[PDB]
UniProtKB/Swiss-Prot annotation:
Full-sequence range covered: 161 to 227 of 372
Gene designation: Nkx2-1
Induction remarks: Expression oscillates in a diurnal and melatonin-dependent fashion in the preoptic area (POA) region in the hypothalamus, with maximal expression attained during the dark phase of the light/dark cycle.
Function: Transcription factor that binds and activates the promoter of thyroid specific genes such as thyroglobulin, thyroperoxidase, and thyrotropin receptor. Crucial in the maintenance of the thyroid differentiation phenotype. May play a role in lung development and surfactant homeostasis. Forms a regulatory loop with GRHL2 that coordinates lung epithelial cell morphogenesis and differentiation. Activates the transcription of GNRHR and plays a role in enhancing the circadian oscillation of its gene expression. Represses the transcription of the circadian transcriptional repressor NR1D1.
Species annotation: Rattus norvegicus
Tissue: Thyroid, lung and CNS. Expressed in restricted regions of the developing brain within the diencephalon, in parts of the hypothalamus and neurohypophysis, and in the telencephalon.
Positions of the DNA-binding region: 2-61
Name by which UniProt lists this protein: Homeobox protein Nkx-2.1
PTM annotation: Phosphorylated on serine residues by STK3/MST2.
Family per record: Belongs to the NK-2 homeobox family.
Localisation: Nucleus
Length: 68
C-alpha cells in the first residue's frame, strides 16, 4: 500500500511477518531478500523486524543475553 500513512510497516505487513516468523524461524541470506521483494520492504527493515521479535522473546523474563 502507498499514498497512505503506512510508510514503515502496516497491519497487513506485520501480519505476514508474524506468520512467517511462526512458520520459518528466520529467513536465510537469499530468502530474507526474496521476502523483501515479494511482500515489499527492504532486506534491512525485514532483518530489523526479525531481530526485534527474537529480542522480545529474550527480554521476556529478563534480558538473558551474555548473562553469566
Amino acid at each position: 500500500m502507498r499514498r497512505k500513512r503506512r510508510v514503515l510497516f502496516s497491519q497487513a505487513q506485520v501480519y505476514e511477518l508474524e506468520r512467517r516468523f511462526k512458520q520459518q524461524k528466520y529467513l536465510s541470506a537469499p530468502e530474507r531478500e526474496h521476502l523483501a521483494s515479494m511482500i515489499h520492504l527492504t532486506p534491512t527493515q525485514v532483518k530489523i523486524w526479525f531481530q526485534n521479535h527474537r529480542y522480545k522473546m529474550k527480554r521476556q523474563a529478563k534480558d538473558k543475553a551474555a548473562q553469566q
